[PDB]
Amino acid sequence: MGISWLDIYHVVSATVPLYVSMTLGFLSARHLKLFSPEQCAGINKFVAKFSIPLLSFQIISENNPFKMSPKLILSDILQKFLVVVVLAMVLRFWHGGKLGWVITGLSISVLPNTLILGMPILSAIYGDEAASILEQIVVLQSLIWYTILLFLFELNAARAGTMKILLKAWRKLIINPNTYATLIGIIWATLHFRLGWNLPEMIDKSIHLLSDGGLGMAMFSLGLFMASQSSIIACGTKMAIITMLLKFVLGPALMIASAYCIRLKSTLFKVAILQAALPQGVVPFVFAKEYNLHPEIISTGVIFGMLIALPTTLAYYFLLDL
Amino acid sequence: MGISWLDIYHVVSATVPLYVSMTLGFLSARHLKLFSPEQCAGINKFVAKFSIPLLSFQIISENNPFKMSPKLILSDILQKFLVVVVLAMVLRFWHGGKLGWVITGLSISVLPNTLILGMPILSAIYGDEAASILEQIVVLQSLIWYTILLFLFELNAARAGTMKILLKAWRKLIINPNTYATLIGIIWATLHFRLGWNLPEMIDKSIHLLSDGGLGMAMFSLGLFMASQSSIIACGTKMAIITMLLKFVLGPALMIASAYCIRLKSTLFKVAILQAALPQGVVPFVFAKEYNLHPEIISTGVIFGMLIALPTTLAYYFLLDL
Numbered sequence: 001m002g003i004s005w006l007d008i009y010h011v012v013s014a015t016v017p018l019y020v021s022m023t024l025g026f027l028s029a030r031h032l033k034l035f036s037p038e039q040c041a042g043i044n045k046f047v048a049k050f051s052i053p054l055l056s057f058q059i060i061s062e063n064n065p066f067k068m069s070p071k072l073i074l075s076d077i078l079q080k081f082l083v084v085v086v087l088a089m090v091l092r093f094w095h096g097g098k099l100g101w102v103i104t105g106l107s108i109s110v111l112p113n114t115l116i117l118g119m120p121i122l123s124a125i126y127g128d129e130a131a132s133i134l135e136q137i138v139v140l141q142s143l144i145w146y147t148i149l150l151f152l153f154e155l156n157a158a159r160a161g162t163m164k165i166l167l168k169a170w171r172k173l174i175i176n177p178n179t180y181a182t183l184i185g186i187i188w189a190t191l192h193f194r195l196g197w198n199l200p201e202m203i204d205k206s207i208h209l210l211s212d213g214g215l216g217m218a219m220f221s222l223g224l225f226m227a228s229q230s231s232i233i234a235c236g237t238k239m240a241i242i243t244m245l246l247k248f249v250l251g252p253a254l255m256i257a258s259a260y261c262i263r264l265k266s267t268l269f270k271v272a273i274l275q276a277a278l279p280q281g282v283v284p285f286v287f288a289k290e291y292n293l294h295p296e297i298i299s300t301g302v303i304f305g306m307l308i309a310l311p312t313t314l315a316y317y318f319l320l321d322l
Numbered sequence: 323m324g325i326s327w328l329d330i331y332h333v334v335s336a337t338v339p340l341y342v343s344m345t346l347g348f349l350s351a352r353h354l355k356l357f358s359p360e361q362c363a364g365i366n367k368f369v370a371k372f373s374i375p376l377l378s379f380q381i382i383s384e385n386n387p388f389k390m391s392p393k394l395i396l397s398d399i400l401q402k403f404l405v406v407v408v409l410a411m412v413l414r415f416w417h418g419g420k421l422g423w424v425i426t427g428l429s430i431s432v433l434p435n436t437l438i439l440g441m442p443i444l445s446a447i448y449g450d451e452a453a454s455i456l457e458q459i460v461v462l463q464s465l466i467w468y469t470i471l472l473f474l475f476e477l478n479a480a481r482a483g484t485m486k487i488l489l490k491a492w493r494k495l496i497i498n499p500n501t502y503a504t505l506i507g508i509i510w511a512t513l514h515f516r517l518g519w520n521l522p523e524m525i526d527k528s529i530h531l532l533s534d535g536g537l538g539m540a541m542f543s544l545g546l547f548m549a550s551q552s553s554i555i556a557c558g559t560k561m562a563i564i565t566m567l568l569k570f571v572l573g574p575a576l577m578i579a580s581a582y583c584i585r586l587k588s589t590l591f592k593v594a595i596l597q598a599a600l601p602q603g604v605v606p607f608v609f610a611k612e613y614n615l616h617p618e619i620i621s622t623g624v625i626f627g628m629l630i631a632l633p634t635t636l637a638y639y640f641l642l643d644l
């Protein structure tokens with residue numbers, strides 16, 4: 001009972017607006033019936049190609065590459081290898097190519113939404129201290145993982161030449177606005193924190209025009225998505241329970257294992273094990289739907305995790321105090 | 323004479339972000355092929371149903387209704403009445419749909435941009451005291467004129483039996499967010515400023531998540547629309563010239579007449595007249611595009627008014643200062 005009820009109010013007040021901006025979208029798409037499915041797709045495309053890239057750019061630019069945390073980087077890199085080995089072991093005694101189930105597992109188990117709903121919740125629970133750690137995690141998720149996952153997707157698609165696979169992955173990666181956003185953000189943060197350069201006021205305000213409102217529109221787009229599909233749970237209970245258990249139990253569990261091995265101390269420990277408990281990302285669903293690799297589970301998990309994030313997040317916040 | 327380039331920099335910095343958003347939309351619609359007409363319509367509808375009404379609520383609820391100068395309100399109403407009379411006279415012998423032209427003549431002549439270009443421009447030209455007056459003008463717009471304009475739009479749509487048409491217009495004006503928002507906002511403004519009630523943090527943040535970035539998305543919609551037109555001057559050179567005359571030679575002139583009638587004096591007179599020569603806002607265009615009532619004319623007016631916002635304002639300042 002170390003955490004007082006006052007902090008529970010902090011978490012709830014930080015999470016409620018995100019759910020309001022999502023319920024509004026769901027009701028507008030399904031009940032109020034304002035947006036036709038084509039209009040919903042257009043809104044989602046705008047949010048995922050102009051708002052998310054600029055939000056990622058600003059988040060990555062507001063961090064210091066020269067003052068990163070090597071321990072945190074190593075812990076995050078080791079967690080996603082422990083997940084790979086766990087999935088490989090568990091796919092040998094419980095199942096065509098099985099590599100699809102490892103790509104899906106890494107998309108479902110370890111890929112928290114540390115960008116749209118990561119900053120608010122964690123920053124409210126742990127103040128401004130979390131912000132920097134979350135940016136550090138976001139740069140990695142945007143530069144290393146979201147690229148290796150795409151490479152794995154391409155390799156799976158080719159299975160049906162590695163050099164041909166690499167060429168195709170590179171060709172499809174460049175057109176992604178998020179890659180350009182991340183690269184420019186890093187290349188600019190380096191200059192900002194080395195030569196002391198700062199954005200001109202015009203550029204900063206222009207970027208903030210499209211990015212400062214991207215967080216709410218992200219959940220609005222997600223609500224439109226949930227409204228679009230008829231069956232909330234695309235598959236039976238089986239998938240839903242498996243994916244929820246995988247994300248919320250195995251994810252933070254392997255993160256705890258990696259942190260203990262690396263001996264992360266104090267706030268880094270608590271903000272690094274609790275950030276792996278955040279609901280699922282959407283980019284993995286984008287990849288799955290584009291390549292049609294079990295898109296019926298990657299979304300059943302995304303929406304369910306988005307619905308259930310608050311109670312589990314509070315539960316792990318209480319647990320970490322112990 | 324003595325105007326420093328610093329003020330020019332302020333005006334240009336306030337104006338550029340809108341152009342950045344508009345050009346991004348235009349490129350996304352024309353050089354790229356991201357958005358189809360239905361998706362652009364969906365984005366515009368979202369902006370007209372979720373962002374503009376929330377911004378209206380914020381503007382109304384953040385201003386005291388008991389500390390608004392009645393003289394300014396009366397002068398604004400007089401200007402609108404004079405413009406309506408003048409346009410009715412002009413359309414009586416120098417004309418298709420007469421009501422379809424009054425809406426577009428009151429959308430580019432008596433609806434400046436007093437929330438983005440107006441406050442920086444005319445708060446740097448004059449002292450900070452004009453901020454309160456401009457805020458009064460903006461709340462008056464969002465409270466009265468943006469409701470009367472939507473009523474006229476719905477009345478025009480119904481026409482496309484006087485009692486039946488008015489009944490249809492009213493029944494369509496009671497299920498529009500921009501009508502309930504301007505009522506809830508004023509009620510809450512009165513409550514907060516006469517009883518001390520403060521909006522809860524959760525609701526305020528939830529409103530911010532959506533309203534924020536509304537201007538960027540609206541200008542993106544304007545760029546997307548302008549991409550459809552064959553040329554930037556979609557309404558034609560004659561129509562562009564007449565729009566410029568309506569917005570920069572008729573608006574300010576009739577506002578000067580209104581101020582003389584109501585005897586406004588001191589900086590209030592200058593702040594009231596010099597704020598009517600600012601480029602027309604985008605909300606009229608958003609509503610026109612949503613209701614498809616000569617959107618090209620208003621879009622051209624906005625595009626070619628944001629370019630010459632500054633020189634006309636300097637001319638008017640020099641005239642008034644004399």
Ligand SMILES: CCCCC/C=C\C/C=C/CCCCCCCC(=O)OC[C@H](COP(=O)([O-])OCC[N+](C)(C)C)OC(=O)CCCCCCC/C=C/C/C=C/CCCCC
Pocket residue numbers: 020024032034371372375376379497498499502503506510521522525528529
């Ligand atoms: C606590 C102290 C009090 C503080 C003040 C209270 C709240 C904070 C203020 C927020 C500003 C919101 C302004 C817009 C509200 C009015 C919209 C609305 O209420 O009516 C939408 C309308 C529903 O009626 P209907 O059209 O289905 O016709 C029904 C016909 N028959 C009855 C026969 C079935 O539908 C439509 O057409 C259009 C649908 C779009 C609606 C979206 C508009 C923008 C957002 C509205 C909700 C706000 C969310 C943020 C805050 C939420 C948490 C408080």
Ligand SMILES: CCCCC/C=C\C/C=C\CCCCCCCC(=O)OC[C@H](COP(=O)([O-])OCC[N+](C)(C)C)OC(=O)CCCCCCC/C=C/C/C=C/CCCCC
Pocket residue numbers: 049050053054057174175176177180181184188203207354355356
């Ligand atoms: C050699 C000549 C060819 C190259 C042309 C020249 C430059 C292009 C590269 C960079 C220019 C910077 C603009 C931002 C990057 C986006 C460029 C781009 O083209 O993206 C690729 C893509 C278009 O691919 P596609 O044409 O095949 O259409 C198909 C696309 N699809 C299949 C996805 C639908 O674009 C999209 O879809 C949407 C892109 C939206 C971009 C939104 C902004 C991204 C964030 C930027 C952060 C920067 C902030 C400024 C900081 C300044 C610091 C000093």
Ligand SMILES: O=C(O)COc1ccc(Cl)cc1
Pocket residue numbers: 373374377433434435436437438463535536537538540602603604605606
């Ligand atoms: O039209 C006006 O006077 C105010 O101009 C705007 C300001 C913000 C938005 Cl989001 C849209 C329009």
